[PDB]
Amino acid sequence: QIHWNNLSTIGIIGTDSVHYKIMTRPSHQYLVIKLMPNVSLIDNCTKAELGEYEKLLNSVLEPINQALTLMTKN
């Protein structure tokens, strides 16, 4: 298909030629990101940092949460 005979006169030499594949998606799988570090082993520790992080989580999530409640509830 390629007219290589015109190509080597200024030096075009294909060192590799392979096929091509694309991936398809027949099914799916579930994967839960639990943002909260589930480590009750903390022995009543990190309370303040986790308590600040709880509030952090509103600016983390809420925009997305609303974006998804607009898709669900309408």
Partner: protein, 357 residues
């Protein structure tokens, strides 16, 4: 029944609609969500397989488990609770920094969000191969090795009392297009008079039947059988580029070299082709150098001209000729210069602007 009424939603795009439909394909809302909630309390596992009846197995992730596994009993003298509290507080705020980088407010559309399995690494605990290993891929096999580039994730659901987000990933399932062949091009330098040049062409080309496409280099990996492009890779070409690779170099452009570096010789199909009007090519058994016509731009070598050749201290054994011989080239035109600096293109588009004026 519907979950999608337009007069109350107003605005949403195609992928967002399909994500909402696929979310309603999940009957998690229909089913009690308490069972999902109540399963995840005691998982205490970095990556666990929590099955869901008449549904795919839920895989549960964690972030930072191992240090909390480490310093319980030791820290009682090894590191104070506050000390470790400060220590954790550091990592936790780093974890918040990472999640605010990726799940944060630079994240554009969480309905249509496409979050690759690479970038989530320290979010997903810094290990990427094990989760795909759970999917049933060895990493010793054709899919895991060729394709780790583009296993994608999407956002499905958000729960506030569980404070958690539910994603669903896809399965890599490879399938080749019927008539796709990928050629990796390559070129050597040369000279005309004393000027040194080489040809500027796209690194790869891809032909699907008659159609020839351009190609991406960032997701596309090369195995000996095929070119694996895990993300959609086939960005189009131009007729004034597609005429170049097929059968003519009258339109293909040419460049000047970067310092003195250039490829003055090459072996292809057992044949040495080079510009021996530039460096030392000398017939080994005979003992004499070979000159070149000034109306010629390279010089090709097969066994019949000289069996073993010396190119600046080497000793090359060649084989039979696989090429037609050098016809004159002065009636076949050469490309214009190429300058890869948008200011120059801008300056000359601003010249084009002056021409319009």
């Amino acid at each position: 029944g519907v979950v999608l009424a337009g007069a109350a939603l107003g605005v949403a795009t195609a992928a967002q609609i399909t994500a909402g439909i696929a979310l309603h394909q999940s009957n998690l809302n229909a089913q009690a969500i308490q069972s999902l909630r109540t399963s995840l309390e005691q998982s205490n596992k970095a990556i666990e397989e929590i099955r869901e009846a008449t549904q795919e197995t839920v895989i549960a992730v964690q972030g930072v488990q191992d240090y909390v596994n480490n310093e319980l009993v030791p820290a009682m003298q090894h590191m104070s609770c506050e000390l470790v509290g400060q220590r954790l507080g550091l990592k936790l705020l780093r974890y918040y920094t990472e999640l605010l980088s990726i799940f944060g407010p630079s994240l554009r559309d969480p309905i249509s969000a496409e979050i690759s399995i690479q970038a989530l690494s320290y979010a997903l605990g810094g290990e990427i191969h094990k989760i795909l290993e759970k999917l049933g891929y060895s990493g010793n096999d054709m899919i895991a090795i060729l394709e780790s580039r583009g296993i994608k994730t999407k956002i499905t659901h958000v729960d506030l009392p569980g404070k958690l987000i539910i994603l669903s990933i896809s399965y890599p399932t490879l399938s080749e297009v019927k008539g796709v062949i990928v050629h990796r091009l390559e070129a050597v330098s040369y000279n005309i008079g004393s000027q040194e040049w080489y040809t500027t062409v796209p690194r790869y080309v891809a032909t699907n039947g008659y159609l020839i496409s351009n190609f991406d280099e960032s997701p596309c990996v090369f195995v000996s059988e095929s070119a694996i492009c895990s993300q959609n890779s086939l960005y189009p070409m131009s007729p004034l580029l597609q005429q170049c690779i097929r059968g003519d170099t009258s339109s293909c452009a040419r460049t000047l070299v970067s310092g003195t570096m250039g490829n003055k010789f090459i072996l292809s199909k057992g044949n040495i082709v080079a510009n021996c009007a530039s460096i030392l090519c000398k017939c080994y058994s005979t003992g004499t150098i070979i000159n070149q016509s000034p109306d010629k731009l390279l010089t090709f070598i097969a066994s019949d001209t000289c069996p073993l050749v010396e190119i600046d201290g080497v000793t090359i054994q060649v084989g039979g000729r696989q090429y037609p011989d050098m016809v004159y080239e002065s009636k076949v035109a050469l490309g214009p210069a190429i300058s890869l600096e948008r200011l120059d293109v801008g300056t000359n588009l601003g010249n084009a602007l002056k021409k319009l004026d």
